[PDB]
Design a protein around this ligand. Structure first.
Ligand SMILES: *[PH-](=O)([O-])[O-]
Length: 490
């Protein structure tokens, strides 16, 4: 097969979540990574993109991110569909959205627009946007909502998607928060991707799934705050109703779109006959009373295929795996400390000689960090390795021979020049310089609505190496507590 990694991930998803195929996950062909002619790798919307410079003077990443948001929205003829984590977009993120909407209106288009956040706010944002659009607002039917799907399971939207006409999609880890990303001399390091094709339709069907729940629950104040322009109603199926069921083809790139429904939207996929072997405990559940959806809830997996997809992506690797995250571990309580099956999958790979690189955010950020020390990751990997290598000594040897583990830097300085630690927020997994995930789903335990793309394209994977992973390792490797390539083993 030309797509061994997607084939494996797809076979897992059809067992886990067959009833959600089409809507919460979907494999498509015919996509394109949407870079420019001058810089074809710039589908990779990293921010700030100021490698080597502790003053972050030339933010080529940020500039491209904001320009691409405006360009995509400005090309809308029918729909603009945005999700993010609250607060609602501000600063130059909001400026980019307003500029694009004004551009589309001036080209003569009448648009439907949805903006969904996970949590007086929605009405205030709607009014700010309408004021800023001026006469362009007459061309726009707007829905704005904030939502929480479960208080007790801490579940709300965490996806960060911008879909236009069901044709183009931007998604990734970037929240639209000016103070953390933009107006600061210690900007957060993160990444989105830009694509076009049928996979953008997949994102539109995912957002229809979320808005269908949101509109059904719009009169329940504890769950949903909703605001619309004029006399407009809630639009649960804007994508289905307005865009073609199969988006046009734009290229040759195969993609698996995958997300999750968190807790409180749907309890189980009734079509699933998935019956997992659930790992033998570990020291993940810090307290006996906590209900652990990540490690001990089969039904949760069936409505959160993204967890299984990411674990399957790791399992598909033949040579090497690079992981860039804010964290691998969560704060307990209320979440379990780690995904046991994920760490087991990484351990299985290292026991087989497949190299694993994990770069996380500096604990000095703890907040863009949830651990005190990298030992909280290496101890856990070592303990899971011990189950499959015969003991603690053989686990340590396997780990030290196959692991790179470090905290993130983007220049030679240990911190930004302004003295603040580097914070990173990517949700990135790449395997074999072939297949990668970029999206909103963290690898640390979390029970939110999330979404992302798994792309199998060696060309694009090589671009990701050159533009992000290689520079990251260049500067980050100085903090490594384990690095097989240099014989480091603390
Ligand atoms: P996310 O925006 O919490 O990772």
């Amino acid at each position: 097969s030309a797509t061994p990694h997607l084939d494996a991930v797809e076979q897992t998803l059809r067992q886990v979540s067959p009833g959600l195929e089409g809507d919460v996950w979907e494999r498509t062909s015919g996509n394109k990574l949407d870079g420019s002619a001058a810089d074809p790798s710039d589908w990779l919307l990293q921010t700030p993109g100021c490698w080597g410079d502790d003053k972050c003077a030339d933010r080529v990443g940020t500039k491209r991110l904001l320009a691409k948001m405006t360009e995509n929205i400005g090309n809308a003829t029918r729909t603009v569909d945005i999700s993010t984590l609250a607060p609602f977009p501000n600063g130059a993120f909001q400026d980019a959205i307003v500029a694009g909407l004004k551009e589309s209106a001036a080209k003569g288009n009448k648009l439907k627009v949805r903006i969904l956040v996970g949590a007086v706010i929605p009405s205030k944002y709607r009014d700010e946007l309408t004021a800023k659009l001026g006469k362009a607002a007459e061309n726009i039917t707007l829905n704005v909502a904030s939502m929480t799907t479960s208080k007790t399971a801490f579940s709300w939207n965490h996806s960060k998607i911008l879909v236009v006409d069901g044709q183009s999609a931007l998604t990734g880890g970037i929240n639209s928060w000016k103070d953390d990303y933009l107006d600061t001399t210690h900007p957060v390091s993160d990444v989105d991707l830009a694509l076009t094709g049928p996979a953008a339709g997949s994102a539109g069907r995912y957002l229809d799934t979320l808005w269908t729940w949101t509109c059904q629950n719009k009169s329940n104040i504890a769950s949903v705050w909703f605001a619309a322009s004029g006399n407009a109603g809630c639009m649960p199926t804007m994508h289905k109703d307005t865009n073609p069921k199969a988006s046009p083809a734009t290229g040759n790139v195969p993609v698996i779109a995958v997300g999750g429904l968190g807790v409180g939207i749907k309890d189980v996929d009734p079509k699933s006959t998935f019956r997992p072997d659930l790992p033998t405990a570990s020291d993940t559940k810090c307290v006996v009373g906590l209900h652990d959806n990540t490690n001990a809830d089969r039904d949760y997996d069936t409505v959160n295929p993204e967890e299984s997809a990411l674990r399957a992506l790791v399992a598909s690797a033949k040579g090497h795996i690079e992981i860039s995250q804010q964290d691998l571990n969560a704060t307990c309580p209320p979440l379990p400390r780690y995904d046991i099956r994920l760490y087991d999958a990484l351990a299985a790979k290292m026991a087989a000689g497949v190299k694993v690189r994990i770069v996380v955010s500096d604990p000095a950020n703890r907040g863009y960090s949830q651990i005190k020390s990298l030992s909280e990751i290496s101890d856990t990997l070592r303990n899971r390795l011990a189950n499959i290598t015969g003991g603690q000594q053989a686990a340590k040897t396997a780990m030290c021979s196959n692991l790179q583990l470090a905290t993130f830097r983007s220049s030679p300085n240990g911190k930004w020049a302004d003295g603040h630690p580097y914070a990173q927020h990517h949700k990135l997994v790449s395997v074999d310089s072939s297949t990668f995930y970029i999206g909103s789903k963290n690898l640390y335990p979390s029970w939110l609505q999330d979404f992302g793309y798994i792309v199998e394209s060696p060309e694009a994977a090589k671009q990701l190496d050159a533009k992000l992973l290689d520079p990251q390792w260049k500067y980050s490797q100085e903090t490594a507590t384990v690095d097989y390539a240099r014989g480091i083993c603390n």
